[PDB]
């Protein structure tokens, strides 16, 4: 048993429904020494007295909010969540296994640059009784500061059947080096609380491996005259790491058959109706290609 | 000591030479797939190594010096029985041109460390190709990232010096 | 019981898909493989002798043969699922492998569109590669026959 | 100690060459039992009497040809051969490492089709006093049958300088199956004997891996008027497996190389080079057939 946050505790049942489980002792936090009683969640049922209640924990009926009272007053609580080892492996009931990119993901992070600021997005069906604490550091054997900004719900969209809830956090590695070649991965540990159930989801990665650039900025067309052929041009996205002399990007100009150019321009043939889309990638490392920047053929 | 100084390299030569490196090092093997990752003997372009654009302007000899170190080390590894053991791969293969180009660019930085030190000659083994195969790709992995910074270093010096 | 029989199949999308299938098998594990050399094996299905996949044994019965074929795909197709390819160093879905996994499940779907159906372990990524290869070389073998089988049917049984 | 041929025995020195080696008992074959004497090879020096001789083989000096004797007579023989294991590796002297793909490859085998008919060569720098006896089989547990028609000497090139001798052998699996996913490998075992030494060379292969179709036949082109272009054609070779309806090949087309599965094609031909084309089994990437041109 450990304290996930004030008056809230996680009980590790390795073996879930098996064995004796675990013997928890709760404590009423109050000066009061006399006539303390314990009740669980609602139930007027006194489970014990004394400033400490000692219980056994196997299933969810074992956890919940414990409350101590004296003379009809609530004195303090003690919410117990369970962390459950299902068939020898922790539970994941919470986050959606994000189209396996690839397999068993839950946390899909990415960075618009080597600044040391990445965002991780996770997916859930769950609309309510959801709490999400985000802890990030770089390296275990001797952690290294990552400030995490609290899990918002970045957007919510429909998956046809039922709604899909998209969370997200921003994180800045406190003292980061964009130029450097990372040797130690960031881990993002996500404390997933849904009601009584407790789950942790983790991601370890190098920023270089989660870089996905914003799409090219200011994509422009410029026809040649009495020519169904155009001067395409774009710019580095505002967010790309600077300087571009160092932090270079490579481009893909697809009309629609794509072409690749480490230049911010190319000359295509408008098949007037289609349009030119351009996307960038790290020029020097197979990170992820940004999204397309598209401009309608003239 | 004082941070070294001196010989400004063929940024252009280096830029292109590095650039090619980032290509060759993303080879990948269908069955091995992409090696991750879990740490953790291999050199690194670190924070305080001066390859970041800002340091690069101040100086860059220490950085460039590390890059030479890296190339030298990967270069050794690539030569070792690791990539020469079986699943026996050809000297014309992507990996062949690799060791090839590594060295080349090593040379282009330190046309032989006059041969005082420059050692750190690789760990050793493993015998039996499975561990071998994995190792091959782990190194290729580390390399992708190494070479990636270098390319930025040069491509940058190349433009700004 | 009597040699089963009946159902076509689309000899061509079959001979088509099947040959695209072979190129796949190879792409996902080129001749630049492992000249071994190594057992009773925890064997896979094999388009064996009298499974009737000969040019002759097909003139008449092709049903047993196809059932075999499909059975292999099921086997291999399952295998690509296994942590064997999932385990470290994990093979990605879009990777040449996970596309085999496609073709197979694809091709399998073109014989039996529903039909009716592994050892597990080990750990040590070390051992996954080895299997990954055994399985692959093994597979490239299966699908080969599988190809010619569908090639013939395309050429001789249909239209 | 076992028999290679008749009267010809091998002596296994697994521990070569630590003492005591092996203690061979030579037995003279004759119904008689008195006045028997023995000599080694072709030297006199009566090594001993009786129907048997107890020798100690450690080295070639102990080996050779033992001869029984009864009154001015030679009843029988016994040729003792040595099979030596040095540094935990049986010798591989006789045959040439042919370090090809990959190393320690002493046996080449190819099949021009799926009949079960394969051929295998070996490269010896040796010139004489050899004997190759081949045996093959499919599998080891319950070995299927394979019939090998004697080690014949064929090619006789010239390496860096010293001559290179090549033997090859016909081999038909007693009961083949072509179209089947061979799941058990073929086993070649070459009992090589160089005088007193003896080695064994083995190879394991599935036909499919060793397929080397023949060159396509009748490259016949038909160019067009006012063009340095030609539509060309070939035909599977007859050695290939029948029916191509099933046993499909796919081809190549040199002069960049182009590839079709069609017995035909159309390529821009200049008087410069010439047109070569080959065939690989369409379904399994195995050996590419040799070339076949019909110079523009
Ligand atoms: O097309 C190039 C090629 O043509 C043919 C030959 O005559 C060669 O010498 C040459 O390399
Ligand atoms: K889930
Ligand atoms: K030899």
Swiss-Prot record, chain B:
Kindly give the PANTHER family that the UniProt entry links to this protein: INTERLEUKIN-23 SUBUNIT ALPHA, SGRF
- What are the cysteine partners in each disulfide bond? 51-63
Record note on quaternary structure: Heterodimer with IL12B; disulfide-linked. The heterodimer is known as interleukin IL-23. Interacts with IL23R; this interaction enables recruitment of IL12RB1.
What compartments host this protein?
Answer: Secreted
Q: What InterPro entries does the annotation carry? A: 4_helix_cytokine-like_core, IL-23_alpha
Q: What does this protein do?
A: Associates with IL12B to form the pro-inflammatory cytokine IL-23 that plays different roles in innate and adaptive immunity. Released by antigen-presenting cells such as dendritic cells or macrophages, binds to a heterodimeric receptor complex composed of IL12RB1 and IL23R to activate JAK2 and TYK2 which then phosphorylate the receptor to form a docking site leading to the phosphorylation of STAT3 and STAT4. This process leads to activation of several pathways including p38 MAPK or NF-kappa-B and promotes the production of pro-inflammatory cytokines such as interleukin-17A/IL17A.
**Inducing factors:** Up-regulated by a wide array of pathogens and pathogen-products together with self-signals for danger or injury. Up-regulated in psoriatic dermal tissues, in dendritic cells of multiple sclerosis patients and in tumors.
One GO CC annotation: endoplasmic reticulum lumen
An example GO BP is: negative regulation of interleukin-10 production
- Cite the record's tissue specificity text: Secreted by activated dendritic and phagocytic cells and keratinocytes. Also expressed by dermal Langerhans cells (at protein level).
Keywords recorded for this protein, A-Z: Antiviral defense, Cytokine, Disulfide bond, Immunity, Inflammatory response, Innate immunity, Secreted, Signal, Tissue remodeling
Q: Which gene encodes it?
A: IL23A
Descriptive protein name: Interleukin-23 subunit alpha
Tell me the GO molecular function terms. cytokine activity; interleukin-23 receptor binding
Q: Which family does it belong to?
A: Belongs to the IL-6 superfamily.
Swiss-Prot record, chain D:
Q: What is this protein called?
A: Interleukin-12 subunit beta
- GO MF annotations, alphabetized: cytokine activity; cytokine receptor activity; identical protein binding; interleukin-12 alpha subunit binding; interleukin-12 receptor binding; protein heterodimerization activity; protein-containing complex binding
Read off the Pfam families from this record. Answer: IL12p40_C (PF10420)
| Annotated localization | Secreted
Q: What does this protein do?
A: Cytokine that can act as a growth factor for activated T and NK cells, enhance the lytic activity of NK/lymphokine-activated killer cells, and stimulate the production of IFN-gamma by resting PBMC. Associates with IL23A to form the IL-23 interleukin, a heterodimeric cytokine which functions in innate and adaptive immunity. IL-23 may constitute with IL-17 an acute response to infection in peripheral tissues. IL-23 binds to a heterodimeric receptor complex composed of IL12RB1 and IL23R, activates the Jak-Stat signaling cascade, stimulates memory rather than naive T-cells and promotes production of pro-inflammatory cytokines. IL-23 induces autoimmune inflammation and thus may be responsible for autoimmune inflammatory diseases and may be important for tumorigenesis.
Q: How is it modified after translation?
A: Known to be C-mannosylated in the recombinant protein; it is not yet known for sure if the wild-type protein is also modified.
Keywords on record: Cytokine, Disulfide bond, Glycoprotein, Immunoglobulin domain, Secreted, Signal
SUPFAM superfamilies attached here?
Answer: Fibronectin type III, Immunoglobulin
The record places domain Ig-like C2-type at 1-84
Show where the Fibronectin type-III domain sits: 215-296
What's the name of its gene?
A: IL12B
Annotated disulfide bonds: 28-68, 109-120, 148-171, 269-296
Question: What disease is this chain connected with?
Answer: Immunodeficiency 29: A form of Mendelian susceptibility to mycobacterial disease, a rare condition caused by impairment of interferon-gamma mediated immunity. It is characterized by predisposition to illness caused by moderately virulent mycobacterial species, such as Bacillus Calmette-Guerin (BCG) vaccine, environmental non-tuberculous mycobacteria, and by the more virulent Mycobacterium tuberculosis.
Assembly, in brief, is: Heterodimer with IL12A; disulfide-linked. The heterodimer is known as interleukin IL-12. Heterodimer with IL23A; disulfide-linked. The heterodimer is known as interleukin IL-23. Also secreted as a monomer. Interacts with NBR1; this interaction promotes IL-12 secretion.
How is this protein annotated for GO cellular component? Answer: cell surface; cytosol; endoplasmic reticulum lumen; extracellular region; extracellular space; interleukin-12 complex; interleukin-23 complex; late endosome lumen
Question: Could you say which protein family the record assigns here?
Answer: Belongs to the IL-12B family.
Biological process (GO), any one: defense response to virus
